[model samples]
Target: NIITVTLNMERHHFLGISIVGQSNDRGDGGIYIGSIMKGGAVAADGRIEPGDMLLQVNDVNFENMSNDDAVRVLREIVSQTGPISLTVAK
Candidate 1:
């Protein structure tokens, strides 16, 4: 089973972090948080953690989605002004 959590934040609010796939050996692999930017919104939220799997951006599922596609979805959401919802699994 997967625990899904949503984070609401503004676009370009500086998540201050990076994400990686499940495998440390592949380029387009898992959906894990790879790094966190200090003083960043995510760090301030204190919920997301490295190795947590990214499930979706807004209503779109990230499952089996390519890393680039996932990023594209993130950018699309982050480019807007409303609250962006990120669904992640721990």
Candidate 2:
């Protein structure tokens, strides 16, 4: 089973990381990308947002880690574990 704890804004939208790009106002929470669906629970809660920085997943830091590393680690953690708490920055 795969439990998606957090969806990195850029990863879900751009599928990559960059030192320059648009910025999102997720308030240093779980990467809030505004809303995806129409007034749905997932959309209402600021769980994922665009341009938000994926700081950490579970307890692993992605700030210093490579993009590839982040992806791999995130996948492993989510797939193996059930629920995870992610840390994001605006």
Candidate 3:
């Protein structure tokens, strides 16, 4: 099932979620959540888990989006200190 979450970016600029892929390191070529951090938003909610493919970071889709672009987008949003809507799937 697909996961759609609208979580505001917090904590000095992160929600404690790490990511991989997007760099073509997965061979499959798609951005994915690498792991979950303890005491984070997802940790308590249990709404997000590792290995989930990220379809987008907000209004933008990850399709054709490079790792650099994705990182910048995510970083930019996080730095804004606002909630971020995530679209992901297993």
Candidate 4:
């Protein structure tokens, strides 16, 4: 008898921002919802999965925002204090 196994290499890419929380844990930090693609992990946040859209960063609209710009903005948001929220569009 013979056995075989197959693995999926497709990577799903999700674009989202992060807000710094009191603790380090990313989940506790802040996860911004972004576009999700089915394949593999293009970035962090494995929870993103597929079929998710980043609605906003700190209540800011993600639409018409460039990936680079979003990243920069995220950095800024994290450095700041107070409650920050990212709106994710499904």
For candidate 3, write residues 1-90 as lDDT tens digits: 988887644543466678685544554477677888876655655678888887777798866677667766876766676777888886
User: How do the residues 1-90 of candidate 4 rate in per-residue lDDT, one tens digit apiece?
Assistant: 111111222332232323222225432323343344344232333533333454465666545555556556766755555444444444
Off by over 4 Å in 3: 8-13, 22-28
Q: Quote the lDDT for 38 in model 2.
A: 41
Give the per-residue lDDT of model 2 (tens digit) for 2-84. Answer: 22344334223222222222234732223223324544323444545555566677778866655556666765764552445
**Model 3 residue 29 lDDT score:** 74
Residue 42 CA error for candidate 3 (Å)? 2.9
Among all windows of ten consecutive residues in candidate 2, which has the lowest summed lDDT?
10-19
- Relative to the true structure, candidate 1 reaches a TM of 0.72
Best TM-score goes to which candidate? Answer: 3
Report lDDT (Cα) of residue 71, candidate 2: 62
Local accuracy by lDDT, each model: 0.68, 0.48, 0.71, 0.41
- Badly placed stretches (over 4 Å) of model 4 are 1-51
- TM-score (C-alpha) between model 3 and the true structure: 0.76
lDDT of 1 by residue, 1-90 (tens): 355444445433666668674444565575678788876667767677877778876788878777777877776766666655567777
